[PDB]
């Protein structure tokens, strides 16, 4: 039955007289377009761009009465170029900065025709999606990024989107592994959105990203913390060694701003102060005061033999107050952003 | 016949014999093209390139007598692949550097006919537009970036552009988010421009962008101010501590030189001094003048009771003269560029 010539003259009677210009059941009820996604990978997430790049397989289902056929048991699979001769819903991603269908060998498109007219149409995409982020807690933040899927031309009177299978409609998300982030949760939505031209259908896919703190421990905190500890060595060197305690202090100032410059490029030029900015400036103040302490001591030792005791006394209290204050500040910082 | 067949026969009857080579109502009065814009976002603004990137929904609306149809009450929404077979205005953006129409799934275009022949036509576009920026007042500046819209092929004897809806013709300006800037207002223009080949219609969209100062306070001014204040420590340390007086003095001067030179890679090569450059140069003169102060304390102390008295008098004044002069300088700076 399924001889080659029979299949040809079956398909040709579907295409001959077909009109790409009109949606299925035009004038009638809306076309129900079922969506389905498989996330292949999330390439990267970038704050400086406020974007993340996504690679996925993307599928769509609908019924087109004009493409029903009988006498062939198969679910026919056709060369992808039939896509240029059929109707397809004009879905597009709102928040993409750049997108393209992969073109290796042949443009990665798929069409499969079932006997009852149910078309399945899908393609492989890499898309750079915009996602601006709440950097008010940068080292300890928790972001929400989404992909908005919407139809461009047709209103709700013509097309309805719905997730095929509900919670099962997107797969492979739990298999993703970002270096800087972990996928805490993902959730789905279906809703109408109304513009001046009418109501438009929408689906949206959303992720929640929580950052892996481990990076900053190596590159941000320990380096700055131990410089702060090093700056306290001034309190233990004898106060008569002016050439040493000043050089020690100013070098830590240079080192502290050196870390700051190597944090200049990694982040966007955001107006408000970030948690990392608060910490680095806090350490800079500790180093800055630790240097001013000598000036206060040197002035007192020479703005006169009891002053030999005054310099020792100020060193003895600074020997305690600075480490104690820094520990209190550090404890408040971590417990603030963890609890509050 | 039937609600399917009747529409198909109508569409074919419209386009059979249609001629895309000629504008609507050729040879009669000009065909008025109404248009409006909905902004999606401004992706970035770059001093280094003197440009900004805009993403928008761009729409057009014009009469064409040849596309009228009767007996159908619906506003036909044909598939977007019709656009290759109709006439469309040759509208274009004059200050465009690089730009494209998004092509995910299907190239983002819309068409919506009406019974009396009026057509609505739209695109989703991302455009990188050149913008000349007056950096003399940077970072306290405000910039007027614009998009210049024009018809290329047709003179004003054939085409007329008008903002559809007047003041409301552009929407979504308040969904523009930029870390560096905030929109003060947007204003619309309509004009006729003249070139050697005729007079052409023009429409313009303009934004008054005001910069946010938060970043530069946090990361540019304060590091300079603290280095300047650090440079006053010398006045409190003993004049006999020559090694400490110097090593810190040339360190602050060295740091100021580093700040002045290494920040400029983030912004374009410009021939005139910018406001913040004047500040970093101004604060630099203070720290160098402070270092010269010590040099002449050492000179009078060693090389020329005067050896004690005159050295003490100069050093004692500097503890109040430099801070007073710096505050006066700082006050004048922040009054000038804010007030005049």
């Amino acid at each position, epitope marked *: 039955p399924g001889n080659m010539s029979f299949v040809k003259e079956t398909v040709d009677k579907l295409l001959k007289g077909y009109d790409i210009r009109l949606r299925p059941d035009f004038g009638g009820p809306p076309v129900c377009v079922g969506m389905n996604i498989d996330i292949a990978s999330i390439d990267m997430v970038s704050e400086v761009n406020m974007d993340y790049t996504l690679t996925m397989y993307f599928q769509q289902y609908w019924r087109d009465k004009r493409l029903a056929y009988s006498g062939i048991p198969l679910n026919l699979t056709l060369d992808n170029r039939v896509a240029d001769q059929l109707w397809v819903p004009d879905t597009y991603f709102l928040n993409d900065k750049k997108s393209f269908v992969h073109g290796v060998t042949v443009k990665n498109r798929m069409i499969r025709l079932h006997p009852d007219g149910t078309v399945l149409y899908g393609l492989r995409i890499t898309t750079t999606a915009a996602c601006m982020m*709440d950097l008010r807690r940068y080292p300890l933040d928790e972001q929400n990024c989404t992909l908005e899927i919407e139809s461009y031309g047709y209103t709700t009177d013509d097309i309805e989107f719905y997730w095929r299978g509900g919670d099962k409609a997107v797969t492979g998300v739990e298999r993703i592994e970002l270096p800087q982030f972990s996928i805490v949760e993902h959730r789905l939505v279906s809703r109408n959105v109304v513009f001046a031209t009418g109501a438009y259908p929408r689906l*949206s896919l959303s992720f929640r990203l929580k950052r892996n703190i481990g990076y900053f421990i190596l590159q941000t905190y320990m380096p700055s913390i131990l410089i702060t500890i090093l700056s306290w060595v001034s309190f233990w060197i004898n106060y008569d060694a002016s050439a040493a305690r000043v050089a020690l202090g100013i070098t830590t100032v240079l080192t502290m701003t050196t870390i700051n410059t190597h944090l200049r490029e990694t982040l966007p030029k955001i107006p408000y102060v970030k948690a990392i900015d608060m910490y680095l400036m806090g350490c800079f103040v500790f180093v800055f005061l630790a240097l001013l302490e000598y000036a206060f001591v040197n002035y007192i030792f020479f703005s006169q033999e009891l002053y030999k005791g005054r310099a020792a006394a100020i060193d003895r209290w600074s020997r305690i107050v600075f480490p104690f204050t820094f520990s209190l500040f550090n404890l408040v910082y971590w417990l603030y952003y963890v609890n509050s | 016949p039937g609600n399917m067949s009747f529409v198909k026969e109508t569409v074919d009857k419209l386009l059979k014999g249609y001629d895309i080579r000629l504008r609507p109502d050729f040879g009669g009065p000009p065909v008025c093209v109404g248009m409006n814009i*909905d902004i999606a976002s401004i992706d970035m603004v770059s001093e280094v390139n003197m440009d900004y990137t805009l993403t928008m929904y761009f729409q057009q609306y014009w009469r064409d007598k040849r596309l009228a149809y009767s007996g159908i009450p619906l506003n036909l929404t044909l598939d977007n692949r019709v656009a290759d077979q109709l006439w469309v205005p040759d509208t274009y953006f004059l200050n465009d550097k690089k730009s494209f129409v998004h092509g995910v799934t299907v190239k983002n275009r819309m068409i919506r006919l009406h019974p009396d022949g009026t057509v609505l036509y739209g695109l989703r576009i991302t455009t990188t537009a050149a913008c000349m920026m007056d950096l003399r007042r940077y970072p306290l500046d405000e910039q007027n970036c614009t998009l210049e819209i024009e018809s290329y092929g047709y003179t004003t004897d054939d085409i007329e552009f008008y903002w559809r809806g007047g003041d409301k013709a552009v929407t979504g300006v*308040e969904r523009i988010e930029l870390p560096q800037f905030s929109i003060v207002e947007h204003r619309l223009v309509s004009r006729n421009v003249v070139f050697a080949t005729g007079a052409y219609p023009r429409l313009s969209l303009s934004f008054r962008l005001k910069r946010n100062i938060g970043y530069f306070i946090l990361q540019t001014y304060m590091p300079s101010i603290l280095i300047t204040i650090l440079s006053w420590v010398s006045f409190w340390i003993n004049y006999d501590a020559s090694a400490a007086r110097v090593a810190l003095g040339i360190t602050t001067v060295l740091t100021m030189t580093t700040i002045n030179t290494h920040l400029r890679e983030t912004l374009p090569k410009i021939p005139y001094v910018k406001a913040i450059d004047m500040y970093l140069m101004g604060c630099f003169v203070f720290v160098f003048l402070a270092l010269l102060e010590y040099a002449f304390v050492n000179y009078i102390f060693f090389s020329q009771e005067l050896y004690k008295g005159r050295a003490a008098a100069i050093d004692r004044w500097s503890r109040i003269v430099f801070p007073f002069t710096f505050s006066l300088f700082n006050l004048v700076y922040w009054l000038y560029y804010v007030n005049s």
Partner: nanobody
Amino acid sequence: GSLRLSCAASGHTFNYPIMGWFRQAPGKEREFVGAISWSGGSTSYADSVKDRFTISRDNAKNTVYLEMNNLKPEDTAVYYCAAKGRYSGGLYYPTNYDYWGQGTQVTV
């Protein structure tokens, strides 16, 4: 006369950068009044209230203020506060707004 209405928000407001005011009167559909963009300060108003009402914000207190200046009898209505998603559609249509206030009342 004049009144001042205010709307306070708590939680993850950064996901909803735009907030607006909508008013309703007996025997009528819900109207648009105005909107505010968090951290941007830009605003737009309906023609019936243009230059009579103004809207402002306090980002630290997380509140939006609507200065309801120069009242007229036609302004009698309840004035719901509402929030809007970042990527939702046009401002003028209430169906785009997700979370809503309790519906304070004004009388004129």
